[PDB]
């Protein structure tokens with residue numbers, strides 16, 4: 001209850017909303033431009049989240065306090081919060097713009113249409129490794145900052161104009177990939193196909209179970225976002241995973257990438273590599289700019 005304005009408060013006048021990006025949890029999300037949100041830049045391309053006009057006072061406070069979790073983060077591989085407009089209406093939350101949208105939708109858009117037209121080949125191992133490192137870098141940064149994600153999935157990663165993959169905005173929720181969630185034990189909605197055996201048994205999530213879900217993200221990149229354990233129902237996924245069952249090596253998936261998936265899928269969470277360990281194993285394969293922008297190569301990484 002009660003949202004208190006702070007240093008993240010931006011004057012409404014500085015924001016210009018243009019085209020819709022799509023329906024969000026609390027309202028329409030727009031693309032636009034902002035004045036003085038990235039230092040003194042007069043014109044920054046931004047994403048603008050809104051609260052619908054009818055919404056109560058509580059909903060606006062809930063929206064504001066939820067988005068305020070992002071105020072703590074500053075990483076090149078984590079989608080940035082740039083400002084808040086909590087004075088007057090519409091209530092807004094200004095964030096970094098990712099023109100290519102979610103990673104699952106981006107991956108699914110790469111599938112051959114099948115209409116006799118020429119098609120771009122599936123992402124190369126180099127392009128797949130680049131995406132791996134970016135995600136793992138965002139995640140190592142969050143873990144270092146004492147966070148456990150609990151819903152690492154391609155749907156919860158965003159693709160920038162230049163193809164940079166980043167960890168998407170937190171607690172987004174509702175309306176998007178409903179089939180990606182299951183009412184386990186007839187209780188709360190859980191991303192069961194992305195869950196570790198231990199999080200399936202006891203409902204506890206750690207950086208180790210985030211590591212398990214990273215392995216599943218690599219599998220989504222490799223399959224162009226197929227449903228994990230596609231032939232199985234949600235109940236069958238639960239039995240299969242807790243019993244030590246694993247995803248199949250995607251067709252034409254390089255061994256090196258499948259080996260990495262298998263490390264993330266070690267039954268014992270303590271035998272799974274950390275995000276730092278994952279980055280280290282692939283640092284040689286990343287674009288040269290990675291050494292200058294990553295959390296991995298930063299002073300903050302111990």
Ligand SMILES: O=C(c1ccc(F)nc1)N1CCC[C@@H]1c1nc(Nc2cc(C3CC3)[nH]n2)c2cccn2n1
Nearest residue numbers: 021022023024029047095096097098099100101102
């Ligand atoms: O990603 C989806 C989406 C996902 C699946 C689906 F089926 N429909 C929409 N949506 C719907 C609302 C906004 C969002 C969304 N967001 C985009 N960019 C963003 C968002 C942010 C933080 C939130 C402000 N920065 N950049 C974006 C670019 C292209 C399509 N989208 N869609």
